[PDB]
Amino acid sequence: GFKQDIATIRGDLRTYAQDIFLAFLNKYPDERRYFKNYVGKSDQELKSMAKFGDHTEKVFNLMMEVADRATDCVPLASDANTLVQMKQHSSLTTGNFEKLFVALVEYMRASGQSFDSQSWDRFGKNLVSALSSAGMK
Amino acid sequence: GFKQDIATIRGDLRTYAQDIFLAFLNKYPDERRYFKNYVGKSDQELKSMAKFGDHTEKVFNLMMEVADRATDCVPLASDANTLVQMKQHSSLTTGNFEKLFVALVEYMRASGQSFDSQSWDRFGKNLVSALSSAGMK
Ligand code: HEM
Ligand code: HEM
Ligand SMILES: Oc1ccc(F)cc1
């Protein structure tokens, strides 16, 4: 289930984080706009850029904490507030998050690993709703 | 073969019962709602709950009894009836059992141990047929 999935991802975090984020950027190429020095680079080029690995790990470290802190895939309001208020997220709207989670769920369904993809879909919806309540456009 | 597999499973019943049951829940996450005390728990979390170990072993002990009593992987009519009329199984349909056996067979095929997975598939199908003939929806 969802709780087990958090442990699965945490068990090989850097790999899942990079693979899911690349799935995101490749599925929504327009989204790469938000990521300066990621433009014009293949997957392998990105995976050799120390900054890409470091930042994507930090993203998924936090995402797993938000997931772990959730009840029935509904995140804490405080976690949503943090995601809205972070300076790094000043240019984002909830559509950006919707996209990330569509890609994540797709990645999970396509994988050999047994994820509860439906729970992740709900988590992404509930996170988006929480972002909206916290004031993201 | 099938009779040897019953011995393999019985020799380490705790471990196989937990393994296979978790494989079932993780493959079919919607099945977890039948086990309310297991909601929101990872695999390793479940393994430190007394009732999880006790329940799962009692399930697999009965399953192995039914398997041992079968002839050519066809269970007794009285055993199928027992499983249909159990108070704990009132809400169940044969689909729930079909799913358990799909998970069990998948687990056997993925394992490093030499199971007669086709016999288990036949047993599951014959058990489903026998549940149906015993009136399960
Ligand atoms: C639940 C989902 C998300 C979480 C938990 C999260 C978390 C984080 C964290 C921890 C950082 C800091 C990374 C660091 O400094 O090393 C970060 C930065 C950033 N995030 Fe998010 N993020 C999420 C979703 C998104 C989405 C959907 C987008 C845009 C499509 C986005 C865009 C950015 C940008 C532009 C930065 C700064 C640039 C960079 O780190 O290279 N984030 N995020
Ligand atoms: C051949 C397969 C099965 C056997 C031998 C079996 C056997 C058992 C046994 C012996 C118990 C009582 C455990 C105890 O004494 O505490 C039990 C309980 C229960 N069973 Fe089954 N079962 C089977 C399949 C299923 C399936 C497929 C489901 C649902 C998907 C299910 C749902 C339940 C539930 C909800 C309980 C009560 C909850 C619990 O004991 O924790 N069973 N089963
Ligand atoms: O540096 C990053 C990497 C991934 C992400 F989602 C946000 C910032």
Question: Which domain CATH number covers B86?
Answer: 1.10.490.10
- Give me the torsion for CA of A56, A61, A67, A70, rounded to 10°: -130
By residue count, chain B amounts to 137
Q: Are A32 and A103 in contact (CB under 8 A)?
A: no
Q: Are B101 and B124 in contact (CB under 8 A)?
A: yes
Q: A112 to chain B: nearest residue by CA?
A: B27
Under DSSP, is residue A3 helix (H, G, I), strand (E, B) or coil?
Answer: helix
Q: Distance between terminal CA atoms of chain A?
A: 31
Under DSSP, is residue B115 helix (H, G, I), strand (E, B) or coil?
Answer: coil
Q: Is B135 left (phi over 0), alpha (psi -120 to 50) or beta?
A: left
Using alpha carbons only, what angle is made at residue A14 by residues A9 and A20, rounded to the nearest 5 degrees? 70
The verdict on a CB contact (< 8 Å) between A116 and B26 is yes
DSSP letters spanning A3-68: HHHHHHHHHTHHHHHHHHHHHHHHH-GGGGGG-GGGTT--HHHHHH-HHHHHHHHHHHHHHHHHHH
Q: Are B89 and B82 in contact (CB under 8 A)?
A: no
Chain B positions touching A72 (Cβ under 8 A) are 40
Domain extent for A107: 1-137
Option in B23, B25, B44 nearest A1 (CB): B25
Residue B98 sits at φ, ψ, to 5 deg, of -50, -45
Both tokens of A29, joined, read: 């190429």
The residue with tokens 């879909």 is A121
Q: In this structure, is the dihedral angle defined by the CA atoms of residues A80, A81, A86 and A92, taken in order, positive or negative?
A: positive
Residue B71 sits at φ, ψ, to 5 deg, of -115, 125
The verdict on a CB contact (< 8 Å) between A3 and B32 is no
The residue with tokens 């019962």 is B17
The verdict on a CB contact (< 8 Å) between A7 and B41 is no
Angstrom distances, CA of residue B66 to CA of B49, B62, B73: 26, 6, 10
Q: List gaps in chain A by the residue before each (C–N > 2.5 Å).
A: none
Pocket test for ligand 2, best of B24, B89, B100, B127 (most atoms within 8 A of CB): B89
- Cα A124 to chain centroid distance, Å, stands at 9
**What's the gap in Å between B116 CA and the centre of ligand 1?**
49
How deeply is A70 buried, as exposed, middle or buried, from its count of CB atoms within 10 A (0-12, 13-18, 19+)?
Answer: buried
Instruction: Quickly count: other Cβ atoms within 10 Å of residue A4's Cβ.
Output: 22
Total domains in chain B come to 1
Q: Structure resolution in Å?
A: 1.6
The technique is X-ray
Chain B positions touching A71 (Cβ under 8 A) are 40
Give the residue whose CA is nearest to atom 37 of ligand 2. Answer: B88
Q: Are A100 and A24 in contact (CB under 8 A)?
A: yes
Whole-angstrom distance, CA of residue B15 vs CA of residue B35? 19
Under DSSP, is residue B61 helix (H, G, I), strand (E, B) or coil?
Answer: helix
The widest CA-to-CA distance across chain B, in whole angstroms, is 40
Chain A positions touching B19 (Cβ under 8 A) are none
Whole-angstrom distance, CA of residue B24 vs CA of residue B100? 6
In terms of Cα–Cα distance, which of B115, B107, B95 is closest to B23?
Answer: B107
Q: In this structure, is the dihedral angle defined by the CA atoms of residues A111, B52, B88 and B39, taken in order, positive or negative?
A: negative
The verdict on a CB contact (< 8 Å) between A7 and B43 is yes
Both tokens of B114, joined, read: 């030499």
Whole-angstrom distance, CA of residue A31 vs CA of residue A37? 13
Both tokens of B12, joined, read: 């380490």
Instruction: Quickly count: other Cβ atoms within 10 Å of residue B55's Cβ.
Output: 17
Instruction: Report which residue type is found at A35.
Output: F
Under DSSP, is residue A71 helix (H, G, I), strand (E, B) or coil?
Answer: strand
In terms of Cα–Cα distance, which of A26, A50, A24 is closest to A105?
Answer: A24
